[model samples]
Target chain A: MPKIFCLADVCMVPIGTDSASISDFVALIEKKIRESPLKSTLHSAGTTIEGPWDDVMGLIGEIHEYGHEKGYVRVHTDIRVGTRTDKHQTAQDKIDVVLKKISQ
Target chain B: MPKIFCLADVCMVPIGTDSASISDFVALIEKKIRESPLKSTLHSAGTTIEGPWDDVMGLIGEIHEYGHEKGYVRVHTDIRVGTRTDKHQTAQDKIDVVLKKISQ
Candidate 1:
């Protein structure tokens, strides 16, 4: 399998003034992803989400739309997507091992 | 002079939640930068801002403070700052020319 890796820094409209609606827009996105046809796994760190390339990119577009509909001014992102090669391990796994080394 | 480039994606509370108070917390941060002793220039793309290293980092801290005060949930960021070298052009400039090539 050609594993796809995407690294992105996403800025969403903060969710604080309204405690009742924490992650309200993001929830909608989750629902859409759950319903999508693509088979994939997702890992998220704060606003950043990573998964199968095409699905994740499609989801990002949905998130952007959600931001627009919610009147959020912007959804700035820096995204890089690449396929895994034979010589390298998964990016997150590599980072995890490096962390293990440092911790040890 | 050594230039600092800081790239980040900051999520803020959706403005629609309080339209009249749009950017209430951000304004405070801008004011603080204007008053700070450090000489710096800020270039921002949405939530990502690039400027002199120390000052930009200080400003990021201030923005984080603002987020905390305003009850913003998260400020997810991917930041990189390195000194310019005699060997090559700046990273952004390099990208610009590559973009120009593609456009041509």
Candidate 2:
């Protein structure tokens, strides 16, 4: 079977923190994602990464483990993953379609 | 151990479909979520649900089973689950804090 393409949006937060800011934790993961081969984009709500199914999901799991080791007492993460077996679509491709529709 | 409070964002898509609009499938799941006791809000990208850890996770699983029974081929669902050991926080409360910060 062909590997399905996946695009996932992820957000992680550390509960019971002293400060309201989560930028530090986010930055830690984002930095790791950038070091990977997958295509990723960081947005206000979360980060979006695209690649093969295992590669994408594996990255998420890795981030969780990293957080635990990094001293996050409690971690809460939200991930929204989309995959299509029909045709591979990149994160920008999806966005471009919406952009084109607005002009029509 | 005390039950943790959870907030999750969920999105489910059916691959190899005829139409680009997955509204029908989305509506199918959204309706079920509304019927449940958990608090939910539907947005353009996806839906956000907040409640106890088990209730929230159970609801997501139920939606997947419902989709499979409904005859969706190649289902790809993305769920981001967040549980906090600290104080309970509602979806609105999180939004309110952000709004306050902007005004300050």
What is each candidate's fraction of native interface contacts (fnat)? 0.14, 0.36
Cα misplacement distance, residue A3 of candidate 1 (Å): 13
CAPRI-wise, candidate 2 is incorrect
DockQ of each: 0.23, 0.19
Please give the range of 10 consecutive residues that has the lowest summed lDDT in model 1 chain A: A11-20
Best by lDDT: 2
lDDT for position A54 in model 1 = 60
The residue-by-residue lDDT of candidate 2 on A13-89, one tens digit each, is 88767899889998998898898898999999899988765566566656665666677767878777664434567
CAPRI-style grade of the A/B interface in model 1: acceptable
Q: Report the lDDT of model 1 for residue A64.
A: 68
User: Which 10-residue span in candidate 2 chain A carries the lowest summed lDDT?
Assistant: A1-10
Writing each residue's lDDT as its tens digit, candidate 1 over A1-104 gives: 32375544344333333333536655655565566554333445334445566666777788768767766544445554555546444556657899999989
Give the TM-score of chain A in candidate 1: 0.49
lDDT of 2 by residue, B6-54 (tens): 6777877887678998899999989999999889989987889997555
